[PDB]
């Protein structure tokens, strides 16, 4: 249900075993857990300028 | 010995570390230094 647009790179984030989302400075989701493999995936929005 | 506290609606500033662990907190309605 979390909708977004970006590149799904490897996060290198140490989530606690209950945690599902990662936030850094705002309401953006910086890192997200894979629902199937439980791999922690980064959310970086696509390149812009 | 067992301890019973009670919960209040209260604002905190939580110190997350680099590992995602909450290491410290400020009770924002404790004393005016905390405000």
Curated annotation (Swiss-Prot), chain B:
Sugar attachment sites: 19
Region (Putative superantigen) location: 17-35
Taxonomic superkingdom: Viruses
Record function comment: Attaches the virion to the cell membrane by interacting with host receptor, initiating the infection. The major receptor is host ACE2. When S2/S2' has been cleaved, binding to the receptor triggers direct fusion at the cell membrane. When S2/S2' has not been cleaved, binding to the receptor results in internalization of the virus by endocytosis using host TFRC and GRM2 and leading to fusion of the virion membrane with the host endosomal membrane. Alternatively, may use NRP1/NRP2 and integrin as entry receptors.
Subunit structure: Binds to host ACE2. RBD also interacts with the N-linked glycan on 'Asn-90' of ACE2. Cleavage of S generates a polybasic C-terminal sequence on S1 that binds to host Neuropilin-1 (NRP1) and Neuropilin-2 (NRP2) receptors. Interacts with host integrin alpha-5/beta-1 (ITGA5:ITGB1) and with ACE2 in complex with integrin alpha-5/beta-1 (ITGA5:ITGB1). May interact via cytoplasmic c-terminus with M protein. May interact (via N-terminus) with host bilirubin and biliverdin, thereby preventing antibody binding to the SARS-CoV-2 spike NTD via an allosteric mechanism.
Protein name (Swiss-Prot/TrEMBL): Spike protein S1
Lineage: Viruses, Riboviria, Orthornavirae, Pisuviricota, Pisoniviricetes
Residues of the full protein shown: 264 to 298 of 1273
